[PDB]
Amino acid sequence: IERQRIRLLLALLFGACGTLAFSPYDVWPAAIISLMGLQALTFNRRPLQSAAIGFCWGFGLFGSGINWVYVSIATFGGMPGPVNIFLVVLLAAYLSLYTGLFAGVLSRLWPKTTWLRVAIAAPALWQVTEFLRGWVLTGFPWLQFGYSQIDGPLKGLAPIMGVEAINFLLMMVSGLLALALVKRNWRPLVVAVVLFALPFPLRYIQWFTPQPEKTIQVSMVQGDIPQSLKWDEGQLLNTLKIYYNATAPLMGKSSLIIWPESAITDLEINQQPFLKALDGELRDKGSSLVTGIVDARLNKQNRYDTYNTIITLGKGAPYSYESADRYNKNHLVPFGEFVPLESILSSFSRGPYIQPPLSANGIELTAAICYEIILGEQVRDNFRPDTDYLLTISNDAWFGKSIGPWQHFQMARMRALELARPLLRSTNNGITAVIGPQGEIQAMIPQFTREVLTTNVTPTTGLTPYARTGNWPLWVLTALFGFAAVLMSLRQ
Ligand SMILES: CCCCCCCC/C=C\CCCCCCCC(=O)OC[C@H](O)CO
């Protein structure tokens, strides 16, 4: 009943089981079953056989939860049908090389099924595997099972140690469950249930203190403009008319107005009179505007540097082309925004890794453009104690009518819970919502519409343990399990 081909096919099923645990489905027990399969199917196999089981397990997970990038390739790349499919398969195969490396190293150094393998060696080795997947070649740390516990019992662990710590606990509990199920021993099962029920009383603790006196009315415009690679005439006039006519009635009623990523589809240097006239009108009616735009700035080398920029206008933030109250994108998308090859004979420019928060009407907002919100370590480093709200703008017009924007929206909720700060997410047509300090959704408008999300938000001024330390304590605990497990395997 173990021809390994059965384990290869079962790894495909247990791998795709994890996709059913994210935002479009919200079934967090699917993560435990997905990890138990990867933990169990790697028992008593060759280092190369276990590596193939891990590679096949990762191929089923990424083949189901990442395939939504095909339409993104079927829109920007222009390649034929079969070529776009091969690029998605090669992406899923590359992302599966890390999970196969995890099961390969776990079997080469721990061939036997011991409680140290599944509860000590597996979680420690899993943190190093997922790190390399989300760091190598400007990594893609997508589909992390810690993002599923945003609404579950283990939510109280994120503000203490981070989302990557929940990934450490899920592998430890599922390892004990897979061990207790094969050996038919009730002892690891009880330890697993205990270690899983312990983090529950942590969700009823609030490291933040809301300030109802500083409650303000915020508005976020959802433009829902059609996508066209060609910059035509009139498209800018129609886009500017749509965003203004939805913003003009808000002035004098909402203090903070937010436009999504690259709302002004023109260069910043070309819309100087449009921004000057809009800044002066906002200052008169007592309001501010935070909008995304593309900035083509001249370097002192007399060269042009293109940035994916966030600019501020209005009261408390007078607009100026040389103002430092802006935000430039740091970590860029590998293919869509730059070219990985340095010399081959259109590329954007990266911003600073740490940028000061945006100030509008005295409100501090640490910005993160689109993909940057899923990087919990970088967001915490940019985070500051005086930050009132977390700001995230994105253009999820790509991969529409898919599970992509939901997985992206779910990872953004974790940043609010990690830092105990409200999240302001404004999109062109994606998931425009307001997330509370505990990851709770306070407001949300539907997708694919041209509406305006207007609600009231209250700032907090807490300091979670993760905000002070970050993933730094997790690597300490990871090194302790790693050194103890390797020394135990080398204790021969
Ligand atoms: C012992 C470690 C000290 C580190 C220096 C503390 C500087 C910030 C001080 C207070 C704000 C505490 C919360 C601020 C959280 C974001 C700032 C931060 O983490 O600084 C990064 C660190 O300096 C390198 O990565």
Numbering used by the authors: 7 to 351, 363 to 509
The authors write:
Lnt performs the last crucial step of lipoprotein maturation in Gram-Negative bacteria by N-acylating the terminal cysteine of incoming apolipoproteins to form the final mature lipoprotein. In the case of Lnt, the nitrilase domain catalyzes the attachment of a fatty acid derived from a phospholipid to the alpha-amino group of the N-terminal cysteine of the apolipoprotein creating the final mature lipoprotein. In the second step, with Lnt now in its thioester-acyl intermediate state, the alpha-amino group at the N-terminus of the incoming apolipoprotein attacks the thioester linkage to transfer the acyl chain to produce the final mature lipoprotein.
Construct 2 (Lnt-C2) contains only two additional residues on its N-terminus left over after cleavage of the His6-tag used for purification. It crystallized in space group P6422 using the lipidic cubic phase (LCP) method and contains 1 molecule in the asymmetric unit. Similar to chain A of Lnt-C1 the full 345–365 arm could not be built but appears to extend parallel to the membrane similar to chain A of Lnt-C1 and other Lnt structures crystallized using the LCP method. The crystal structure of Lnt-C2 is remarkable in the fact that despite crystallizing in the lipidic cubic phase, it’s substrate binding portal is devoid of any bound substrates. In this crystal form, despite high B-factors in this area, W237, located on the opposite side of the access cavity to E343, can be seen in the upward position coordinated to T271 (5C-left panel). Also, despite crystallizing in the presence of 400 mM Ammonium phosphate, no phosphate molecules could confidently be built into the model. Due to this accessibility, the entry of any number of chemicals used during the purification and crystallization process could deacylate the thioester intermediate in the absence of the second substrate. This is especially relevant for Lnt-C2 that crystallized in an open conformation that exposes the C387 to the surrounding environment and took 6 weeks to crystallize. In chain A of Lnt-C1 and Lnt-C2 this arm is positioned at the membrane interface creating a highly open active site cavity which allow the entry of any number of chemicals used during the purification and crystallization process deacylating the thioester explaining why this extra electron density is not seen (or at a very low occupancy) despite mass spectral evidence.
